Amino acid sequence: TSSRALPAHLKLKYRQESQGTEEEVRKQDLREALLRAEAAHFAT
RNA sequence: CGUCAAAGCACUUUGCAAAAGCUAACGUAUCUGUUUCUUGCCUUUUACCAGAAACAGCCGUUUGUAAGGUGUGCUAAUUUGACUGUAUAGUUUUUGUAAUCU
Ligand SMILES: [Mg+2]
């Protein structure tokens, strides 16, 4: 109907294996990782 | 060419589905549009300039399959596939050095 209403980007992208899917974040331990990263930045 | 098998066959209309897997012309051809950037010309918008990225559209192509049409056939025609396919008594196999007994 209009130029900007034409079909475009018909394929929705999903997070892949290494991009941080729900499974990987659920398996991961975010608390300890956050603590190590905070300590590492403090070290500088 | 031959044997066997199943399929009517040749041309054609329409529907449905698919088309890179091992780097490669579905198309030895070739247009347009949108978004986000960087540019050109620029008094403001459309229309624009010419490069990129990500997306789409249109003109076409191929294959499979389903249902039909035309012309010829089923008192045969053609097509597709498969095949460990050929002679021959005259020494290297299939027209017998056999029987005899031990
Ligand atoms: Mg004004």
Swiss-Prot record:
Transmembrane segments: none annotated. It comes from the Eukaryota. It is found in: Nucleus. Involved in pre-mRNA splicing. Belongs to the 40S cdc5-associated complex (or cwf complex), a spliceosome sub-complex reminiscent of a late-stage spliceosome composed of the U2, U5 and U6 snRNAs and at least brr2, cdc5, cwf2/prp3, cwf3/syf1, cwf4/syf3, cwf5/ecm2, spp42/cwf6, cwf7/spf27, cwf8, cwf9, cwf10, cwf11, cwf12, prp45/cwf13, cwf14, cwf15, cwf16, cwf17, cwf18, cwf19, cwf20, cwf21, cwf22, cwf23, cwf24, cwf25, cwf26, cyp7/cwf27, cwf28, cwf29/ist3, lea1, msl1, prp5/cwf1, prp10, prp12/sap130, prp17, prp22, sap61, sap62, sap114, sap145, slu7, smb1, smd1, smd3, smf1, smg1 and syf2. Belongs to the CWC15 family. This is Pre-mRNA-splicing factor cwf15. It comes from Schizosaccharomyces pombe (strain 972 / ATCC 24843) (Fission yeast). The gene is cwf15. The chain holds residues 24 to 67 of 265 of the full protein.
